[PDB]
Every structure is written in structure tokens, then in C-alpha cells.
Symmetry: D2
Subunit: 299 residues, 4 copies
């Protein structure tokens, strides 16, 4: 619990680049990992939902995990999202994660089927087992999983021996604050980017997100401002993030960020995997507009 103090920070949810055939664009991936590190991001959360995990294989996921150890180990933090519906698939990646040098593992509450809470804790323990002492980030996302944990349940999920943090992809800051109060040293990752500033105020000590792949820096400043006690530009940074977040809801959060990064020239093909479609044409104007904008406010 205390051992996980380091896992604190702003961590990007790495996208997975794909080629004209839907295959892993291995080259574009390699670039993106850099694009991220030169932004000054604290760490990368690899193979999560943003990372398109669920339209890939145990193998394909493992290539990414690997192709990212070669690059980003030692320098920044690496959390490996090893989560599948199957517990055994999860432990395969947890051990592949231990192998490849990773700093922590993480798993989405398994989904589609309605598992009990006892079943949920057994899923997690077994992935920790196979983690061979790597920290666990329990990954909580009701919107998309369909899972609905009480407070007490969530309290129990994070005091399992080997649990080090919480991805809280939830909009409830009453709960976010209740979690802090309860576990005063827990590493509490804000998960919805549209409310980072707000989540930090309730007891977060960092976050994870997908938008960082194109404007990471904005999020670090918000942390700085709060440390400082400068409530004013903190809100300027939240506010500008959501004008981008606003547009990435309109286009498609993944195919938007990728159709951006194609303009920043870090992706040969901005595609997501089927069944996800191509971005609609008329956004290209503004998408082209946003890459062009974002490159200059950094440099």
C-alpha cells in the first residue's frame, strides 16, 4: 500500500497504431512512445481500453508490451494493463509483464458476464500471484464494463495484499473523496480527463488518460497550479482540455486522436480496427486545424 507511493503521476493511455491492412503499425507505435516521453509524461499505461486491447490478441498485446519495454523502460513508469474476461488470459500477461521489466500490472473489472464480488477479488488475487510481486492497479470503469461496485466493495478491492492503486474512471467525486479519506496514501488515478482538475481537488494524487497522447503537458500544469495554490490557470488548463475533449467526443476519441497524430505525422494510418469506422470527412478540416495548433504551443 505504501510500496505503491511511486506509482503516483500523470500517465498516458497509449494508443495502438495500425496499418492499411489493420495490422500493427510497429513503426508508428515506436514514434508515439517517444512523442509521449518528450512531453514530459510521468508514465505509460499500456494495453488498456484506449490501447484497443479488446480488438487484439494475447500475442498482439504482448508485442506492444514488448515493443514498449525496449523503448521506455528505466526512463519513465510502465504499468501493463493485462486485463481480459478470462483470469488465465490475464495471468499470462501479468507474467509476460513481470518478464518484460514492467513496473506494475492493472486489470479492468472483467465484464460482459455478471461475476460476483467474491469472483472479482479471486480474479485480482490470481493476477497478483502471477505478477510475482509487481504492484496491481485495480481498473474501475462502470460506463463501459457494466460493473457496479459499492464503496465497501471498492474498499475491499484495494486492501487486497498486492494492490497498489486505483484507476477510478468515474464521475462521482463524492466517492473519489470518500476513497481518499479512507485510504490516505492510496495512489488514486483520475480516469475521466474532462474533470482532472476537479478530481485532483477531491483526493486524487494523479491520473491516467487517452487525451494525453496529444496534449499531455496541459495536465501536468494543472497538478503544478494545485500544488502552488493557483486555482486560476488550473481552470484555464482544464477548460482548454475540454474544448479538445469536446471535439474528440464528436469525432471519435480514438480515431480522432489518431487522425490528429497522422497530421503531427506520428501515424502512417489513423485507422482504428474494425468494427470502428473511418473518421468522418468534415472533421478533417478542424482535426488538421488542431494538430497544426498543438504543435506550435509546445514548439
Amino acid at each position: 500500500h505504501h510500496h505503491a507511493t511511486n506509482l503516483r503521476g500523470v500517465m498516458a493511455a497509449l494508443l495502438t497504431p495500425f496499418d492499411q491492412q489493420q495490422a500493427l503499425d510497429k513503426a508508428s507505435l515506436r514514434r508515439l512512445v517517444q512523442f509521449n516521453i518528450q512531453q514530459g509524461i510521468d508514465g505509460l499505461y499500456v494495453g488498456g481500453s484506449t490501447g484497443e486491447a479488446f480488438v487484439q490478441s494475447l500475442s498482439e498485446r504482448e508485442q506492444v508490451l514488448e515493443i514498449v519495454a525496449e523503448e521506455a523502460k528505466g526512463k519513465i513508469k510502465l504499468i501493463a494493463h493485462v486485463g481480459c474476461v478470462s483470469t488465465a488470459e490475464s495471468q499470462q500477461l501479468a507474467a509476460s509483464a513481470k518478464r518484460y521489466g514492467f513496473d506494475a500490472v492493472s486489470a479492468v473489472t472483467p465484464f460482459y458476464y455478471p461475476f460476483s464480488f467474491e469472483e472479482h477479488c479471486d480474479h485480482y488475487r490470481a493476477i497478483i500471484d502471477s505478477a510475482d510481486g509487481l504492484p496491481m492497479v485495480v481498473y474501475n470503469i462502470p460506463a463501459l464494463s457494466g460493473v457496479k461496485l459499492t464503496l465497501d466493495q471498492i474498499n475491499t478491492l484495494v486492501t487486497l495484499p498486492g494492490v497498489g492503486a486505483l484507476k477510478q474512471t468515474s464521475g462521482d467525486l463524492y466517492q473519489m473523496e470518500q476513497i481518499r479519506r479512507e485510504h490516505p496514501d492510496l495512489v488514486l488515478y483520475n480516469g475521466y480527463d474532462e474533470i482532472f482538475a476537479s478530481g485532483l481537488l477531491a483526493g486524487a494524487d494523479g491520473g491516467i488518460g487517452s487525451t494525453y497522447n496529444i496534449m499531455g503537458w496541459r495536465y501536468q500544469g494543472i497538478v503544478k497550479a494545485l500544488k502552488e495554490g493557483d486555482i486560476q490557470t488550473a481552470q484555464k488548463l482544464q477548460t482548454e482540455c475540454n474544448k479538445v475533449i469536446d471535439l474528440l467526443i464528436k469525432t471519435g476519441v480514438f480515431r480522432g486522436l489518431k487522425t490528429v497524430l497522422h497530421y503531427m505525422d506520428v501515424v502512417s494510418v489513423p485507422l482504428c480496427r474494425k468494427p470502428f469506422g473511418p473518421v468522418d470527412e468534415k472533421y478533417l478540416p478542424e482535426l488538421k486545424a488542431l494538430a497544426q495548433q498543438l504543435m506550435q504551443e509546445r514548439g
Copy 2:
């Protein structure tokens, strides 16, 4: 409507053993919010148990409070009912009693269209005869689930002045604040106050304010001179209290505390609300001594 910007207590409505309006306690509770340091009042809301009162009851409360408080603070009158005609009767009555504004929850139970909602609000803003209207939004209890634009359109309606945002979505809070720079934006849920501010609210209307509304102005102060640590500490001490209220049942809890603060005489809510569980009293009893000693 900067006059409306503020920490407004959602006034509770006192009853007696026989479930009758307790006007002694109404008046005291009104004074105990003045002396406490509140910017204003929001009378006859959900928190005031509006929907277990008759119109005549909601009128006698309005009248008393303007009697005790007009000129002394801002007063908003929640005049909302499911019926437009009931709602207008109360708008007229609020205007009569000298109120600064009126408010009305989205009308509920039956499905109404968004056009029908707006006409509801047009009709009310009119019987209100010049009072500016606070649109009242509480989706979890109303069951009305408004989009963003729809909410942009309700707030530009003729003679709408403010939005009570009783929502937990601090993304939508920002999108309103960023799209209506001037708008008086009230935070609804007491437990995200600090963060609702950050997201872009300029104040709040809240039920627990009735017992520790300094702690929420104390939140506002703390945030304005960048003392995050006192602010978070407050919210935290607010939620500590909100955790107990959520367990005891919030209105009856809140009243039972004022019953130990000697303000309210019978700590009842109306049937079918029940009494507070006898087991919770020492914790409420000593929340009050605790709280009386902080003020």
C-alpha cells in the same frame, strides 16, 4: 443577476407532532441562517418537503420567511409543481410576498417534451411578473435527463436568471460555465461543492447548509485565497457529516440536529418519511454539540 451569486441554504420546513406546519421553528431556523452567515435562502424546494405540502402550506411558509428575512438576504422561492397552473399560483404568491426570485424543478412523473418543459417555464416566468427564474435541475430525483444544448436553451429563455445544477457531472458543469460566462451557476450536491466551484459554479443551494453553512462559505473563502488544504479539509468535514446524514436520512437527520441545537422543536419529516432510528441519536446529539461549539 450577480445579486443571486451565492451560498443559499435549502431551507427545511418544520412540522409538529401532528404533522402541522411549525411556524415557531420556521422563524428560528430562518434566523439561525441569517446569524450563521448565509447569503440567501431557497424556500419550498425538495429539501423543504415541497411535495408533501399543499399549495396553501407552501404559501404560508413563503410569507413567513419574507416576513423574517426580506431585505436581510436574497430569497429564492421554489414554486415548482408538476402542474403549470399550481406552479403559477405559487409564483404569484412569491411576487406578492416580496421575493427576489423563483425556482422550479423540471416537471416530473409524466413524460413532458422539452417544448412542454419550456412552456411550463414561460408560463411561470410570467405569473412571476418580473422576478428572475432559477431553472431547477435534479435528474436523479426528477427523472428528466436534459442534453447540453437543451440546457443552453432553457437558460437563455426570457427572464431566466440562474441554473441550480443538481448534477454530479462536473464536465457538464464546465461546459455550461464555458458557454454562459455570466450565468449564475448553483452547485446542487453538497458533497462536490469545492470541485463544482473549480469546474465553474459560482455558488450553491444545499440542504446541510442549514447546519454548517459557514463550512461552505469557509470552503469558498479558502478557495478564493488558494488555501486548498483548508478547503479540502472542510469538504472532508462536510462529507463526514454527509456520510452520517445519508445513513440517518438527510432531512430528518438535519432537523434532529437543530432539535439538539434548540432551534427546531419536533424533528419530523412528513409521512411517509419515518423517524430517525433511535440508535443514531448520540452521534447526531454530539454532532450538534460539536457543531454549536464551532460557530
Copy 3:
């Protein structure tokens, strides 16, 4: 005797949104002739939650003058407030009603225990009338569990469940668990299915236009005329499609306008009027419905 096809009465208003007594009366009659086993008085469909207690009492009385000893009359006295529900109940007794009803009190979060008392007080104030416990999650948000349902349908004084839920598994667990219990289908649109899983009746809105069509669904099922039921239900749903699109209450009131029963087809504000463009179909529908019976 509470068992049957029991039409949820609409409250016809005049051009000033006041109780159109003549039409009210014309609708009691216009229903009475359809075969309907009874009329459900002052429920949601009766626009009750946009009337004062007086106006609701006004209806209970008028109707009970047009109807008592002829058909079954059920009085929905439910408000959010227990005291107010109690009043409408004692009235329903005075006017000599067959049963009272009371939808789970809504808006505020009440405990199931708190609910239970609500009904205990209303069963006392109805002074020996039986209660129709009136479930409706969609509109009230009250999300009842089977176990909670089980105690409520066996509170001493209660005698029936208005099961306004499209969950036909739960219908059967209830028929199973209380084999005698009277239990009304609430969705007009799954009535056929609902008797199949074990409702033995319906309290419904759209019965005000076609009680017989529903009655003849009950016939066919009873008579194993499975082909018939469907045919009917399908024509009973081709309307419900229409009415859902029109505005339902207004839709029905209008149809009763083009049937010469209701002088002015209006609901109270905030329900506005029926769009103009849907008047032809409603008129055609009206003039297709008088043909049958």
C-alpha cells in the same frame, strides 16, 4: 370480484382545464357499455397528479354516482404524502367504493419499510375497503424486488397488485407465489403475454377506447383461440404505436372527441395539445373503432 378488465379512467376537462362533468359522465357511460368489468378512478391516466385533492374527490363522487352497483369502481387515492392519500381514501369509502389503490410514493427516496407504513395508514383510512397495491418503476423510479413485493401483496388489508411492469418472469414468480392473488397486467401492449405468464386482468388506459378488444383477447386465450389473441394484440398495438407518437392521454381523449364522447380533447399543462398533423389518423382511427361493436 376485483378481477377483470378495469379501464383506467381519463379525466375529461373543459376548455378552461376544469372538470368537464358532462364528459366525465359520458365517459363512465361510454365505458360501461363496452363490457368493461370496472373503471380505475384517479390513477395516473386520470391525470391525478395535476389535480388538487378536491378535484380528485370531485371525480370519485361523480363517477360513483354514474357507476356504483353497475360495474366495478376502484379509487386510486395515492399521493406522495400519506396524510393526503389518507383523505382521498376516507372519501372513497364515503362514496361507497369497491377498492382503493395507491402507487408507491415517489420523488423522494423512501425505504421499503416506509412504503409499507404508507399502505398501512391508507388501508386503515379506507375503513374496510381492499387495497390495489400499484407498482410502476418506469414513472416512479421505485425498483421493487420480488421479496419486497411478496410482503406488500400480503399486508393485512391488501387484495390485489397492479403489475405495471413489462417483466413477464416476475409476473409468473408472483402468480406462482400467490396462486389466488388478483394481479392486473399494466402494460396494455403486452396484455396477451401478461395473462399467459399469469395476470388474470388488466388495469389499462387504452381500454377507454377498446375495452372489448381487450376483453376479446381474454376470450380467445380462455377459449384457446391463440390465433385470435395475436391478431387483436397486433391491432391493439398498431394504435399504441400511434398514441405513443401522439401523446397518449391526449390521444385517447381526442379519439373520444371524434367519437363524440369528449367535448374538448385536452390535458392539463404542462401536457400541451396533440400535434395537428396526427388528427387525420386519429379521426380515421376513431371512425374505424365505432364500426366494430
Copy 4:
């Protein structure tokens, strides 16, 4: 696709204690389904624990089923994954084992535009290569809240000859049937099967049919002659079991009953499904004996 009409068992996938596919108990469970009265089997669906298998495992299951059942009865391959191409791979495979029908769940987890679903269902029809498709809808587990128009646009995509309707909204079932007199219409919730047939459904695909598909076939029958009273008794007894199988957990519960009837060797579901509770064994045991006789 009128030939696809009927009561189909949603096939369970037997596993051993290593969580490896138990191939001798698969074939047995297939033979037990055939011997039982079934019109056909629906393979590697949610009931088949699809979403905890790999593509390989899903393919090896199918193969065993088509070796054992093709010709004899009707065969539907649930080839649905989140990814279109994985569905596409399972699709062609499904055709190599000479299946009658292909199926796929509306892709889940990520929110997909309706358009993006329609294409997905086309790409799988292409690969199905002449095998009809069974649009499989199940809002409760998928979180995909399809409307009426949307659904009508699906089931008229060219190639689609069935809808699996695992939605408990029997008004929607009538609208779909009123609009589509010839569409095969599989009831998906076993606990409202009678009521769903009355609403429109002419077929069924379900998990409980693995232990009492004859009861379900009798409902179709009972109904069609106009014997409501037995349809009723049947559905009420079908429902008595589901009460049971919900308490224990449904797949494992069923795997247990199936174990007692000498069909499945090890009644395990793949983690994170837990084992069934020891306390429920008496009654689960007791249910098997009841059903073998009946």
C-alpha cells in the same frame, strides 16, 4: 431462411479441472441434446463461454460439434467477437465445418455507431459465404440499446435470416413480428418463452434447453394446437428450475445437473466463474434425478 426455425440449445462448453476443453464430454453433451428432441444447436455463444476462449478453442469446439451433429440437426455457429476480423476468421472456419447458420452478438464494451454495427454484420456475412446470419441482441449483457428502426434495418440486411432476441420487452417482439411476418424469431430469455412465442417468436435459443429442451418443444406444440393450459404448466416448471439456476449460477448450475445425468465429467466454468456451492448440491443432484425420469 424458414428452415432455421425452432427450439435450439445454446451449447455449454465442457472444461476439465485444468480449464482445458473437455472434448469427450462435449461430444456427449452434443449427443444428449440430439437424443433429446432438439431442432438444432447454437454453438459457442454466451452460454458456451465464448468470451473466455481463444479463437483456436472456439474453432476446435465447433469442429467437434459439426463432426457429431451435421446432417442430423441444424447448426448455428456463434462467431461473434468484439473485433470484426476475429468474427471474420471464426466465420470462414464455421463454413469449413459446413455449418447451417452463423451468428454474432452486437459488438460490446466500446460504444459503436449503429452504422459501425451494420457493416460489422456485413463483413461477417461475406465471410460466412452463403451461411445465413442470426443477429444476436442482448442489451442487458452487451450494453447495446438498439431501437426499433435500427433493428428493422439490421434484420433486412441481405443475408440475415434470424434474430436472436434476448430482450424481455415483448412489445418490441410484436413490433418486429408485425413488421416481419417471415423472419425467424428466437426468444432468448428462457423464463418468458411461452409469452414470447405469443408475442411473435417462432423459435428459441437458450441455455436451459441443455437440461430440458423437450419441455420447451412442448410449449411450441401446446401453443400451436391452442392448448394454453399445458404451455402454462410447462413454462411454470421451466421457471422453477431457473429460480434454482440463478441461485447457484446458471452455467455452472447446469453443468452440475448435466454431470449428474452422466454427461459432463467436470462441471466447471472457466475463471473467473467460481465453482458451484456445496450447499446447492443436494438440490442440484435432486433436480437431475427428477429430470432424467421426466
